[PDB]
Every structure is written in C-alpha cells, then in structure tokens.
Design a protein around this nucleic acid. Structure first.
Lengths: 57, 57
DNA sequence: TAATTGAATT
DNA sequence: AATTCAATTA
C-alpha cells in the first residue's frame, strides 16, 4: 500500500498544527504540503487518523 | 511489552496451515486456537508475520 | 521473531 | 470509522 516515514520536523510540525486545530482545509493542507515537502493527500490522511486517535483518548 | 514460545507441534501445525493457505479467516482461527490451546489473537498475529516473511524473504 | 505501531485503504 | 498491513522494537 505505501509507507511515508515522516521525519521529526514534519511530524513535529504536524502535531503543533493539530493541537491548535483538529481540522485543516484544503488550501491550508496545500500550504503545509509545500512547506513540508509532502503530498496534500498525505496530510489529509494524517489529520483523519489523528482525529481518530484523539477520539479513543 | 511481551513474548509467546511455541511448541514444536503448534508451529508445525501453523506451518502446515500456512502452506495450504496464507490467510485464515477469523472463525478458522478460533478452531485452531481451541485445538492448540493458544489465543485467537496469537494465531491472527502469526499469520500476519508469516505473510510478511513469505512476502519479504 | 513475536508483538506493536500507525499510514493507508475502503 | 473500521480494518489492514508495512515497519519496527525488543
């Protein structure tokens, strides 16, 4: 299926963004993507999964 | 964390099942678990790992 | 190498 | 939201 291994700078940035807001829109994810050098799709899915994780805990 | 230690006939039975089919459904797994006195989850995880082995080396 | 983690799928 | 399976970790 895949395997994106985020580096601590990417996951670290992602986690800072998640706690200010558990949801990010397409333009914003595009912004994070250019900045993070990752596909938009990758960021979308991470937020989806992070919301799920958060729900359980 | 962990660690389960298989008996020789438990693993031979596992390896036998695997050569016939690399995947067993949730209900066959319960049949094997009853028969081998091992946990349902243990067998699920073993097929997970054995497939990774087959797929990789 | 058994068990866990989490990225991707559906 | 529920599962799967590619990677670790111990």
């Amino acid at each position: 299926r895949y395997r994106t291994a985020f580096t601590r700078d990417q996951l670290g940035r992602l986690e800072k963004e998640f706690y200010k807001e558990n949801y990010v829109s397409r333009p914003r994810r595009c912004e994070l993507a250019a900045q993070l050098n990752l596909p938009e799709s990758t960021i979308k899915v991470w937020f989806q999964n992070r919301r799920m994780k958060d729900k359980r805990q």
